[model samples]
Target: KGFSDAEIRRFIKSYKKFGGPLERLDAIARDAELVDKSETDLRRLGELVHNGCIKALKGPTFRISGVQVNAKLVISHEEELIPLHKSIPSDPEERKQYTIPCHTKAAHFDIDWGKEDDSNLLIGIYEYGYGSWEMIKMDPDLSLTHKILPDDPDKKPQAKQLQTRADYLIKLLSRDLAKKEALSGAG
Candidate 1:
């Protein structure tokens, strides 16, 4: 047999005080002596009250409405009608941003370049031919890493990063150059 719906026995008249529904129920139940005076009974009453409060309400239900529009037609038309591709040189602002070095936090902190990045930069330099800083910085595989300014997700590795890093690499490699120069001078 199915159970009958519970009628609202008493409306616990509450004032302007604000809190959770369970606390409100507990306070009203305790004051009225409707719930047992003991701690165990008070705790048990709270649990049952929570169940009753939930049971008193209806659960959500849904129904599918009218057929969705054939959005595919408009989406396909937009893609077909509009040109989506752009050559890098076409956007002057973007090209400038890519080619210029900005005053970024990387100046104050340690370089973001790792050993692998250093090698990658060198390889890229050699592959694209020496010190084509703009080309090396823009190469997709070589430009994988960047010092992210948290607020600006669109920021890419600056041309200065590559140039400065190349300088540092040259300085380290200078020992070999120095040896050759010294030997030639002595000869």
Candidate 2:
């Protein structure tokens, strides 16, 4: 379909905008409401996009260690690169470097997680042994509950979670009994 004059004007307006045009082609088309327009419009839009940013070498010219002569870098363009795109590594080995690690137990806390799972965890500890991380980990009853815990390559499965929970649960039991004894009437 032939693009209307208003559509072209709106497209140009979006093209002049920094965020949308610098991000994705589909974004620009969607923002400008020009998705239904023909290839001719795309060609014109592509031309505008091409003119918007400068082309350059893939890397800065410099001498490399243990190399005889510095070879020329491949041609690359920043026409599609968003602003401050280089602030984070494009292919990061570990994403945690850029993100704050979430250690808040409250975030993972489920009210239901407190009752059934806690009981099962205690039962598993009794049947297995105190600080029996592996034994409790393998328990069939707690498997379902523990399965919900984080399981990433960098993290061990529910064993650590169970151990931590057990540690705190046992610690609180001491205070709990002491408070009960202190509050009770003389027999």
**Residue-wise lDDT of candidate 2 within 1-187, one digit each (tens)?**
2455566555554444322333344445655677776656566654543443333232333221222111121112122222213222234343113321112233144333544455455444433334445555565745443543445534433555556775565444444444555889532
- Candidate 1 lDDT, tens digit per residue, 1-187? 0111111112122101112323344444433434434445444534443444344432322211221222233233223212111111224344333321112223322445455555555554433333445445556665533442223434434565456655555444444445655989953
Residue 157 lDDT, candidate 2, scale 0-100 = 35
Query: Which of the numbered candidates is closest to the native, going by highest lDDT?
Result: 2
C-alpha TM-score for every candidate: 0.29, 0.33
Task: For model 2, state the Cα shift of residue 41 in Å.
Answer: 89
RMSD of 2: 24.2
Off by over 4 Å in 2: 1-112, 142-151, 154-157
- The ten-residue window of minimal lDDT in model 2 covers 68-77
- How many collisions per candidate? 0, 0
What TM-score does candidate 2 get on C-alpha atoms?
A: 0.33
lDDT of each: 0.37, 0.43
- Which residue pairs does candidate 1 place in steric collision? none
